[PDB]
Amino acid sequence: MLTILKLGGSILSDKNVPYSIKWDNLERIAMEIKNALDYYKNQNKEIKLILVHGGGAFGHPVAKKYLKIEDGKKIFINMEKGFWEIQRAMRRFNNIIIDTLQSYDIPAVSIQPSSFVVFGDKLIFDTSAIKEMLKRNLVPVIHGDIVIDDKNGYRIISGDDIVPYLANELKADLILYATDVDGVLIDNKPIKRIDKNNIYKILNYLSGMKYKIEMIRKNKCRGFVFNGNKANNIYKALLGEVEGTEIDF
Amino acid sequence: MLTILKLGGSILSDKNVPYSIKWDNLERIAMEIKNALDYYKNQNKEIKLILVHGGGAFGHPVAKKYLKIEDGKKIFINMEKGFWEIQRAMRRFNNIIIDTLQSYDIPAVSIQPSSFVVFGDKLIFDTSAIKEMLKRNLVPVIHGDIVIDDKNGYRIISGDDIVPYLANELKADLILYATDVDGVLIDNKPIKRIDKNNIYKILNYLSGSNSIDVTGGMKYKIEMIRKNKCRGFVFNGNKANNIYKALLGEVEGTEIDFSE
Ligand SMILES: C=C(C)CCOP(=O)(O)O
Ligand SMILES: C=C(C)CCOP(=O)(O)O
Numbered sequence: 001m002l003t004i005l006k007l008g009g010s011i012l013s014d015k016n017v018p019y020s021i022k023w024d025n026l027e028r029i030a031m032e033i034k035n036a037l038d039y040y041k042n043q044n045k046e047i048k049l050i051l052v053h054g055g056g057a058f059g060h061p062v063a064k065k066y067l068k069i070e071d072g073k074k075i076f077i078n079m080e081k082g083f084w085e086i087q088r089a090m091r092r093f094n095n096i097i098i099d100t101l102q103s104y105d106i107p108a109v110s111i112q113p114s115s116f117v118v119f120g121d122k123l124i125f126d127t128s129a130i131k132e133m134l135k136r137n138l139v140p141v142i143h144g145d146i147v148i149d150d151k152n153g154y155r156i157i158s159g160d161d162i163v164p165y166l167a168n169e170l171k172a173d174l175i176l177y178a179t180d181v182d183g184v185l186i187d188n189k190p191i192k193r194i195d196k197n198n199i200y201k202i203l204n205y206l207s208g209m210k211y212k213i214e215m216i217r218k219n220k221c222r223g224f225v226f227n228g229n230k231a232n233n234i235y236k237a238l239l240g241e242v243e244g245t246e247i248d249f
Numbered sequence: 250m251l252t253i254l255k256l257g258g259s260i261l262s263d264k265n266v267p268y269s270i271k272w273d274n275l276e277r278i279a280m281e282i283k284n285a286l287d288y289y290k291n292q293n294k295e296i297k298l299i300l301v302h303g304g305g306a307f308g309h310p311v312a313k314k315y316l317k318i319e320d321g322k323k324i325f326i327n328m329e330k331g332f333w334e335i336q337r338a339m340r341r342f343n344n345i346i347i348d349t350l351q352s353y354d355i356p357a358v359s360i361q362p363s364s365f366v367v368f369g370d371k372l373i374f375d376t377s378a379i380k381e382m383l384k385r386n387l388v389p390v391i392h393g394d395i396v397i398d399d400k401n402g403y404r405i406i407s408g409d410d411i412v413p414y415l416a417n418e419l420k421a422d423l424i425l426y427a428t429d430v431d432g433v434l435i436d437n438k439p440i441k442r443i444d445k446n447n448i449y450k451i452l453n454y455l456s457g458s459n460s461i462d463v464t465g466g467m468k469y470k471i472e473m474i475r476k477n478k479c480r481g482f483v484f485n486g487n488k489a490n491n492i493y494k495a496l497l498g499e500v501e502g503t504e505i506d507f508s509e
Contacts, residue, residue: 080356107329116365118377126375129365132397148381
């Protein structure tokens, strides 16, 4: 029923180019998601879908402006100005993505964490609204954002924080990570799987693909890391599976 | 003391001209909010301020396209386009308002109800982040928005729904209603004070046939203030300095006192 597809940095926007958008790729990714949803409408299978994207060439660039290094500590400053300016950037990127999805008749809607989510100790993140939206078969689109931290004051929640959380909070049947690599690379090769056995030797090797791997296990989750730039991977990924690294916890 | 300023009326936008923006009026208002914030710093007084605005010529016009009357009632349709459409329009208005407020160094941030609020017999509306934001001297700007309900449907949440709710949740001290009128008009004249010695006497008149507001607007504002045993002002937000004065607690319009 429920799937969480993450569109990770750099398939949507080049990081080394502030305010950049990879239009064709975005246009294609949106199409494959549509063709996927359609496929299921025939099989008459109810498939609830959530979407997550990063800060790409929007979130980061603007943030970097209010992050100062001091005593080896990432420090936000001038947040009187920084909070809005980061919000604003993520709002642009979020509109662009949602409009495109909408143009393919994907019933996407904006989820803006900065408005309600709180980091620190526990993760305060009321999924009430999201559950309802899913009951309507709407497709909530969540994005990395600036967010309050009741301990550190400010902090940047990312997709890696959001996906795992929601998958557990919402009991997701299938979680997908679209990236620019053919999966988790070991010695420059994508392992077909990651469980409870070879993991130990994997955490050492990696000593945020790690962060990602740990965040999902910390939730007995289970997801696929694949390449989003390969025409059809997303469409395949959603339908059942294609090539990529599997992570089961 | 925490204050809630409700922009409202048609002081920011002319509902008649779709996507209308009363720039001049919107800019002056930012000044005044600024003048006020600077004033509370000089007099060294702690103020937490929340702003709320409605849909103006943005929310309503778009929303109406997805509203139908069915069996003597309202129902949203095609919300697979409608929800985003209304979000989109509101997000624009919110941007314009916040960008401006910022252009006067007012630390405004965006609160988008559509993302987390559920409209039930009781609102589901986590105010954790807002509290932290106020804690850090940010100015949270909430706006009317589309939202899902807990009954297979959708609902429009307005400033009217948002203000009272927050007044309660956050235990506000002062409620400010910037409107298109000088106050609660009684004989085309803003009554100075409303309290537990005339409220009912006032409600009844508001309900009569010689009342200027038959939309039940003022009545609702009065009752929530009274319900939040706090204090509020109803004033003209189109007049120079009323918003500045109001924020200080001295705007000449109509006072509503039920604190203590
Ligand atoms: C940079 C911001 C605001 C969020 C970054 O998170 P990502 O989407 O994981 O890159
Ligand atoms: C029309 C929408 C989106 C809500 C408008 O809220 P209000 O103008 O405060 O009633």
